[PDB]
Design a protein around this ligand. Structure first.
Ligand SMILES: Nc1ncnc2c1ncn2[C@@H]1O[C@H](CSCC[C@H](N)C(=O)O)[C@@H](O)[C@H]1O
Lengths: 6, 244
């Protein structure tokens, strides 16, 4: 996923 | 005749006399931040902030909080973001965050701006809030990294983003958590937070004590074995691995 903290 | 306090796991709370049904409904209800001092006091309906005026919790007597209202007419409202609207008041700062952090040039090379501690604090201290628009994982993962500098996963259904031009503090400063730079050796972590203006979001919380003017960093936590990550991070990742 292209987001922080998944 | 008594007062109830209802704490969130993050340490914030709602406090006041509950109505006949045990709901936080009335004109003298407060949300109290995790410092147990900064408060938003006034009209709530079933725990939702309708009009909270900035206040300081001065003492408690028999469990009942006694507040002093701040001057300035700073009032706040429950104002959860949507997919297209980050805030009804993008330039109205969070009053707890404003005492704790500021934005300046990062001490990290080529890393732009960073987030810094205004005063010395202990471990486990909530420092900053990561509010933003609420979009899907599908939208985020199917677009290029250049659009995903500020995305933060909230849960399995929602990603929080601060899209341009709201990444500039002149356009948005209601929250500042999207200003924390990455470190593989961080002093802070992301944690869940239930905010009376922003709703369910994430916050930045210290891992350990931090000094005044120390830069706050968090591990961005990109998947290293899907690295599904921007280039500056992939570079950094190797450097880190070697120093281990
Ligand atoms: N450890 C690091 N090294 C280099 N650049 C970093 C970094 N951590 C964060 N960044 C930069 O910060 C962006 C994420 S947003 C963090 C705040 C940003 N520096 C700003 O000025 O608004 C990244 O896309 C990257 O440009």
């Amino acid at each position: 996923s292209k987001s922080k903290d998944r | 005749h008594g007062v109830c306090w209802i704490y969130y796991p993050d340490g914030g709370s709602l406090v006041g006399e509950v109505n006949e049904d045990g709901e936080m409904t009335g004109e003298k209800i407060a949300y109290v931040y995790p410092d147990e001092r900064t408060a938003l006091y006034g009209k709530f309906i079933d725990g939702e902030m309708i009009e909270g005026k900035l206040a300081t919790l001065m003492s408690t007597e028999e469990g009942r909080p006694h507040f002093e209202l701040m001057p300035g007419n700073s009032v706040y409202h429950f104002d959860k973001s949507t997919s297209s609207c980050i805030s009804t008041n993008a330039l109205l700062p969070d009053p707890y965050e404003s005492e704790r952090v500021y934005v300046a040039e990062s001490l990290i090379s080529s890393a732009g701006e960073g987030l810094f501690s205004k005063v010395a604090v202990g471990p486990n201290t909530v420092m900053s809030f990561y509010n933003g628009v609420r979009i899907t994982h599908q939208e985020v993962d199917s677009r290029d990294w250049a659009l995903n500098g500020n995305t933060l996963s909230l849960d399995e259904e929602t990603v929080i983003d601060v899209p341009e031009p709201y990444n500039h503090v002149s356009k948005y400063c209601a929250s500042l958590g999207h200003k924390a730079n990455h470190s593989f050796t961080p002093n802070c972590i992301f944690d869940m937070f239930v905010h009376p203006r922003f709703g369910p979001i994430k916050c930045i919380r210290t891992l350990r004590a931090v000094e005044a003017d120390e830069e706050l960093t968090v591990a961005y936590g990109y998947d290293h074995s899907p690295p599904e990550a921007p280039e500056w991070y992939q570079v950094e990742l190797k450097a880190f691995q070697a120093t281990q």
